[PDB]
Amino acid sequence: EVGVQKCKNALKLPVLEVLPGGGWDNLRNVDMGRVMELTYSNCRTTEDGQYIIPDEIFTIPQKQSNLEMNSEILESWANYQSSTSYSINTELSLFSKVNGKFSTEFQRMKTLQVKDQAITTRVQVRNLVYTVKINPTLELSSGFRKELLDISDRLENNQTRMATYLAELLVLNYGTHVTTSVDAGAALIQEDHLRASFLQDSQSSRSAVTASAGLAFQNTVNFKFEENYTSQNVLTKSYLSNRTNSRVQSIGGVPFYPGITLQAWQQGITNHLVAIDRSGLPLHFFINPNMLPDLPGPLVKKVSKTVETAVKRYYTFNTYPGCTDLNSPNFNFQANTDDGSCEGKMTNFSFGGVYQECTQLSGNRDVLLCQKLEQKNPLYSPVHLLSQIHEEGYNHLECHTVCEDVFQVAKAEFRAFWCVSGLLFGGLFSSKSINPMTNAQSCPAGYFPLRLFENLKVCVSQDYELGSRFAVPFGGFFSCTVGNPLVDPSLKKCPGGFSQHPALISDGCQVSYCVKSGLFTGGSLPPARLPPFTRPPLMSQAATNTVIVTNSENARSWIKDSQTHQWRLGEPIELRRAMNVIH
Amino acid sequence: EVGVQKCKNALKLPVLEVLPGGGWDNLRNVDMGRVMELTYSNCRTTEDGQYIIPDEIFTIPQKQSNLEMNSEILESWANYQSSTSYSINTELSLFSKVNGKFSTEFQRMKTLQVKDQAITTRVQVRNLVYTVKINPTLELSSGFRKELLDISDRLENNQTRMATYLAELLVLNYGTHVTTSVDAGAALIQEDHLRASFLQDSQSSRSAVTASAGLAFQNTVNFKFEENYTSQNVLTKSYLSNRTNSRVQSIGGVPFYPGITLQAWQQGITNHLVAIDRSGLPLHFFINPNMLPDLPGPLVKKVSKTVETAVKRYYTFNTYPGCTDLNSPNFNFQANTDDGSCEGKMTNFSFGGVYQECTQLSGNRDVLLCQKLEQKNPLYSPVHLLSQIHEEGYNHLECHTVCEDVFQVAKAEFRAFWCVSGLLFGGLFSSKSINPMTNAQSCPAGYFPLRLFENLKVCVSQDYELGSRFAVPFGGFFSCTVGNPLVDPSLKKCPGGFSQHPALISDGCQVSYCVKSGLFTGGSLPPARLPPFTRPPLMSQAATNTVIVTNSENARSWIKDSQTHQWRLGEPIELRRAMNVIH
Amino acid sequence: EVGVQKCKNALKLPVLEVLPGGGWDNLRNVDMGRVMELTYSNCRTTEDGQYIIPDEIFTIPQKQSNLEMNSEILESWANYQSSTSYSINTELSLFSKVNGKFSTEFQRMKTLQVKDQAITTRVQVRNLVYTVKINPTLELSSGFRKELLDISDRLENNQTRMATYLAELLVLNYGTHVTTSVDAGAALIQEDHLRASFLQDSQSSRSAVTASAGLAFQNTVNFKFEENYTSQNVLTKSYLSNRTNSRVQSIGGVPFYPGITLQAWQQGITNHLVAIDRSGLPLHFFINPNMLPDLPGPLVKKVSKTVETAVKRYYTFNTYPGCTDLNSPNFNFQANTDDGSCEGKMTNFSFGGVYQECTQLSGNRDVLLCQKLEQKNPLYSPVHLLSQIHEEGYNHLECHTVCEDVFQVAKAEFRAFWCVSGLLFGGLFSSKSINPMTNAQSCPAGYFPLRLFENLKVCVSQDYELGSRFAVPFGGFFSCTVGNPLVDPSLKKCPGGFSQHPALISDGCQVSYCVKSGLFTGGSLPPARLPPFTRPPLMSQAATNTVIVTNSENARSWIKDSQTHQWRLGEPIELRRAMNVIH
Ligand SMILES: *[C@@H]1O[C@H](CO)[C@@H](O[C@@H]2O[C@H](CO)[C@@H](O)[C@H](O)[C@H]2NC(C)=O)[C@H](O)[C@H]1NC(C)=O
Ligand SMILES: *[C@@H]1O[C@H](CO)[C@@H](O[C@@H]2O[C@H](CO)[C@@H](O)[C@H](O)[C@H]2NC(C)=O)[C@H](O)[C@H]1NC(C)=O
Ligand SMILES: *[C@@H]1O[C@H](CO)[C@@H](O[C@@H]2O[C@H](CO)[C@@H](O)[C@H](O)[C@H]2NC(C)=O)[C@H](O)[C@H]1NC(C)=O
Ligand SMILES: *[C@@H]1O[C@H](CO)[C@@H](O[C@@H]2O[C@H](CO)[C@@H](O)[C@H](O)[C@H]2NC(C)=O)[C@H](O)[C@H]1NC(C)=O
Ligand SMILES: *[C@@H]1O[C@H](CO)[C@@H](O[C@@H]2O[C@H](CO)[C@@H](O)[C@H](O)[C@H]2NC(C)=O)[C@H](O)[C@H]1NC(C)=O
Ligand SMILES: *[C@@H]1O[C@H](CO)[C@@H](O[C@@H]2O[C@H](CO)[C@@H](O)[C@H](O)[C@H]2NC(C)=O)[C@H](O)[C@H]1NC(C)=O
């Protein structure tokens, strides 16, 4: 009787199913959450008189219908068009070469080009109908507003590392962007994968290749699967023979089956409309004093700085520099960002060994952390590489039968070294990784592991006749703070010929290691690594109540009242009586 | 008149049958339980106006329809795609090489490749319709909330080994994950199994193999079973002759029969939608102070640590290291995880014998446990391998005719040894296993059993002329704490050439034994070993009442009131009056 | 107006006919009883809107449809797949090699392979629809709860041997398992039995055998019985000639007749759904203090130990060790469990004779049991083999015409011996068996019987010229406590070349005897031996009232009130006043 169903009973019209305002992940092109609030109170319609739209939504009739007769050749996977999220992946940002490179449509296309030495062609029937946009005066959703107040409460009780944790659960549930405009329509695409040596002789008749690819697309749709085709004349005999893959997907409308008139596909697009393009803005753009009137001024500029840090950390991880030229050697298959590390010679290095010590600062009673946090050399110059503090909580139970239990914490800082007539290297495996020497979390035969950063193992053998089959050279560790001195004989990268691999993200700082195997390189493409990148804190910090919030340079002060009402602006006679009881 | 039927009478629409929130087992890809609460109070619909969804559920219209013209070749069973649970099996975890390897679809495919020396190809018509997700603000179910309170009660009455037992009945009923997003659709798959020598000559024309496999798939669906096929031209005469198996399964929609137009299959998918992909999060992720507001803070971080231990124990069991290379010798067929134990030479070892002693600490009256817990040598250096305590309860009946009965317990610790001109080895069989020398729970001819770990038998014969037909060599025992010293002449694995086998899980610690038979290896694939891995306790521990719960480092205290009301936060004037009567 | 018919009048929908919660016998794959309570109060439906389900039941839509084009060859009957109860027969148990080996489908398949030297192939169209499961919070049925209280009453009046008898009537009525999940669907199977020498020459073209077997299956279903087949080309001329049997069974849906389109069979599966797979848990798993809140704690752990003993006794009986290799001699046809007793030489033994004595302890008046309980030698070293006490009740009638009758009992312990120039052996026959020398309960010509264990006869003749046609050698008696000393010249088995046979189960202990005939071996397969394995007791034990039940180690006590109300927990001030009047 309220909301949609009140409008839907009076009008008896469908609701438009393609709406802006939701969140958007831009590494994996998926949408998530609902940032903006959508209400159906005025019973608005599209001025066709055909759909029902919310109140803060205006549509623009496009009624456009493209129809292409030539496929387009896109040879490299580095410059990637998306066909559904092209306007939002190509924004001007620092990470424009990482957007969209963890999606379903991209990971298939990179696989089919590398494993077959192939080039791809697509041809398309696109058919845009509306453009749906949001008004500039707009209200946040009920569930998204409550999660911004919780980050503000943790920042005003001096609880960092809990506000940081709640900011990374905001990226996980709402993405990195907000879509401000969509495009309702229905596409129909065919992608083929031709052998790359079929293009190189037909450099003059490249226009004859793509003319037959768009010719075969309209035989596939118009003719039923039995061969009544009109394309097999001259070069639709090697086009069929140099191709390595073919698929046809429809995105809106009715489902596609071979042999359906393009007349009949285009008459089922009504009431089956999806978003075939979209654009938007980053997520921290919508955190400003205009959208949040209840909080003070400089407090929402501190929440918006926390969310901006969590989004940029999510792009800093899931970024793999390496070599990208396919015909060159040292080709890294997991790399999504070029480095210039191609055509670079190598030089062998000898590492003496790794060792690890612990400190055991506070928790001397009832918990002994400083036995597994220590690792000594099985057999140069060591480097420190990390200063990491490990905290653990335990439980007493004082009984008196009534009892009580108290929770302490136990700190133990550890230090992990490596030496710059030497131990061999057999790979690494962690609690989120495997060793690709064995395709399993095990060192090979003869090798023995030893812990280095409290979560991963270091496959090492001291021999020179039996473990020489799995021995791969080593290039050096570095971190987010200290680069290795092996490059520039500093910078944070591998030397030439080597490739880096992530290992052991530890509280907003990952360390890396350089190898030269060729076996760590290949395999399947890695998935995206989702936030939170930190385990939850133990609530060890005490809450410090803040009552008055001020800034010095325009003489504005916000006084929180009793009862936790709200933040009102401080009149200059009440803050005069509130600072004496404070100071 | 409430719930679904109120919405279903007014709207007269079906309910969407593919919903998130339920549990999920990730070794065997099955779903179980319902972790999240789903309510039908606002009578929401999918904005098509076609289905009825719960209140805390938002759908995303995809309306996508893939159609592939080439089969894909996947040669090895080690890297396994699932086609229905691929997004959730490939999560970043320690046990990513064990997920999905106890399911129906996997165990068939490993069988058909090993027993035939075959490779598999699949081709598919996939047709995704919606994406159904859960809101981040969400309530636990009524039945799952009550089983988390019962683990908290056992932890606050100092009843360990009962809270551990109730945590393993939570994994049995709700799985190891919670699905947070599903994909409603309907697939149609054909899998074939070609002979592996048919690929190796057609290395150049591998693209001609897969083009005919996708050609035969569309003759099978479009043509009725009588041969009107258009594929038998050149190489659809050995493709039919090198194949070893073939099946066609449909997953959603109407049932498949040979000869049905793809037009007609795709028009029955409405109202018959199933989950063709899903993703989720682990089960202990959803146990936090946000979801459980009634319990104290550090108490739900102790329940969530108990459930995390029970899940990781379920992956530690059902893990079989061994050799995996098929053409190599020493191939272990039961192994699902590689070891590097391939291409390793063997060395014979002589074991003197096993013997077992008992202690009989407490139950000296009315129960004699220390006669069957003892086993002496029928005929080096012994090792201890285990220190296990065996508890049994009995019953007095004091009569006075009125009577009364009291229940005691009887402890008897046992020790089981083995010696590092020697007894022969004929296999083992237990209360959950058989001896594969006989395919039965019996020692062979000439062999006599003797107990070793209070539940299994050790087939042994002292002769050298008659029991030499069933004698297999022996490689050594080890446990979850002590590895054998026979490897590295320590580590917890077999020496080279040998294979390990589980025997006698005893209270969260299994022991293993290394053999070299070739007969223990083969057979059928083992099923998953389900929790609980411990028999129920005898309630021997006394309940210790806890009233006040505190942590030291933010000065928060929770005071349980009378009547067992609930846990309220302790004001600093009531805990001042509650600690004096306590201490 | 209540229950099903209230929901069935409002909704006008059928009820789903495949439900969990019932019992299950696992030797004979049949279902029996109803352990869990099923109520129809909320009028729930399957979210199709198609069936009506109970309240504590959730279904999972599968909508899957397999279709196989190759038969599968299963050569041996030892590893047996069931096609309807495969998930529940393959549980991890001690008796996994006995599950399902007394069913209708197994006993036919073992018969057709032994009597014809044949191998079996099956091909199948499987079509799974739903998966129906039970919630973890669940209530026992009304009739099953009342039979668990009756076992508890006999255990608390010190009436053993009546609680043991009532526990074996619980296995008879409710089976050994409870099904927790079923699979609604409809299969369609063809089984053939080919001659075993037809496989051995087609080792390379085994893939051509199974391709024609799945080809003949789809000619049988699609074509009417007149020969319009498309299979008779090359090897569908000896496949028809090497086969020894053929049947086609349907399990759900409409009945099968030759010539029906697979289109038409798959459209009758709606409203005709049966269980095509199931899984479950043992019966004593569901006897715990959670399911039975009224009884005390350690009392339901004593009922659950009694039922576990009665189930394991039912698997200990119906287990026949013997030789299993078919081409080897000494092949035992009744044996369902291997022994290693194949390829073993024999040695003749001479037994002097059997004799039997009685004691007549108590019933000296009015009943003379010690004349038929005695048997003396008709003509070494004797062994005792059994100490069994025989009790009989009689009736006085004291008259005074008014009268009264009193019932006593008469005990008479008997002892049965056999001697380790000798009596010949002609077989045995009992009150539940026959002599297979005559296929009747009679000794052969010249032989005379003599009683040994108060119920069976021992066919014996002292001659050496006339009873030499029916004389078979003898291998020795043993029991559940004492093995024979003839093996290991101890163990409880036959010597080599001999086979054991059951005789005279007497109060939870059977004795066995070893022969070497070849005529006792063959015949028909024995049926399952159902509980109770003990005649009912004579109520000779006096009832001892128990009022207070306690355990020592958590200081909990349960005080039964007056009137036989119930068992309430004892407060520490009432048991203080209840133990003084007790002790
Ligand atoms: C507010 O929080 C910050 C962040 O932890 C505190 O700063 C640290 O406090 C510890 C405790 O003495 C010091 O050892 C560190 O050196 C401090 N670090 C920095 C960068 O200042 C701060 O003390 C807290 N303030 C209050 C009043 O609790
Ligand atoms: C892949 O493409 C090449 C073209 O670069 C094909 O090679 C030509 O095939 C035609 C077919 O008759 C010949 O007449 C030409 O002589 C070939 N060479 C050149 C340089 O044009 C090749 O055949 C294609 N692959 C397949 C499998 O057909
Ligand atoms: C709480 O439970 C723990 C777990 O059993 C008890 O700890 C053990 O108690 C026994 C009894 O004296 C000792 O023999 C063990 O050495 C203890 N083990 C450990 C690791 O502490 C503990 O005593 C219980 N506390 C109370 C008050 O009952
Ligand atoms: C399995 O595949 C092999 C190909 O590796 C087939 O062998 C070829 O069969 C064709 C059939 O006429 C012959 O012309 C070739 O000479 C064979 N050899 C090669 C190297 O191509 C084999 O026939 C297939 N199996 C069956 C049963 O047909
Ligand atoms: C409770 O029942 C048991 C089981 O029969 C009784 O135990 C036997 O009692 C007879 C009668 O004196 C003795 O001859 C046996 O030696 C007893 N056997 C055992 C194993 O104890 C027991 O006496 C009964 N108790 C009462 C109070 O009636
Ligand atoms: C049972 O199978 C055997 C195959 O092992 C058949 O023997 C063959 O029959 C064909 C029929 O013409 C002959 O051409 C072959 O020479 C036979 N022998 C071999 C070794 O292949 C046998 O005929 C089958 N039984 C029946 C009754 O047909």
Numbering used by the authors:
A (entry chain P), B (entry chain O), C (entry chain N): 11 to 389, 399 to 419, 430 to 449, 458 to 526, 536 to 629
Q: Can you list sentences taken from the study reporting this PDB entry?
A:
Macrophage-expressed gene 1 (MPEG1, also termed Perforin-2) is one of the most ancient and highly conserved members of the membrane attack complex (MAC)/perforin-like (PF)/cholesterol-dependent cytolysin (MACPF/CDC) superfamily, with orthologous sequences identifiable throughout the metazoan. In contrast to other perforin-like proteins characterised to date, human MPEG1 is an integral type-1 transmembrane protein. The mature protein is comprised of three regions; an ectodomain located in the vesicular lumen, a transmembrane domain anchor that spans the vesicular membrane and, finally, a short cytosolic sequence. Each monomer of the 16-subunit ring possesses an N-terminal MACPF/CDC domain, a central multi-vesicular body of 12 kDa (MVB12)-associated β-prism (MABP) domain and a C-terminal region (termed the L-domain).
We therefore expressed the human MPEG1 ectodomain in order to investigate its function. Electron microscopy experiments revealed that the majority of recombinant material eluted as a stable multimeric complex. Accordingly, an integrative single particle cryo-EM approach was used to elucidate the structure of this assembly. Our initial efforts yielded a 3.5 Å structure of wild-type MPEG1. These data revealed that MPEG1 formed hexadecameric rings stacked together to form a double ring (or head-to-head assembly). Although this structure was incomplete, particularly in the C-terminal region, these data provided a platform for directed mutagenesis.
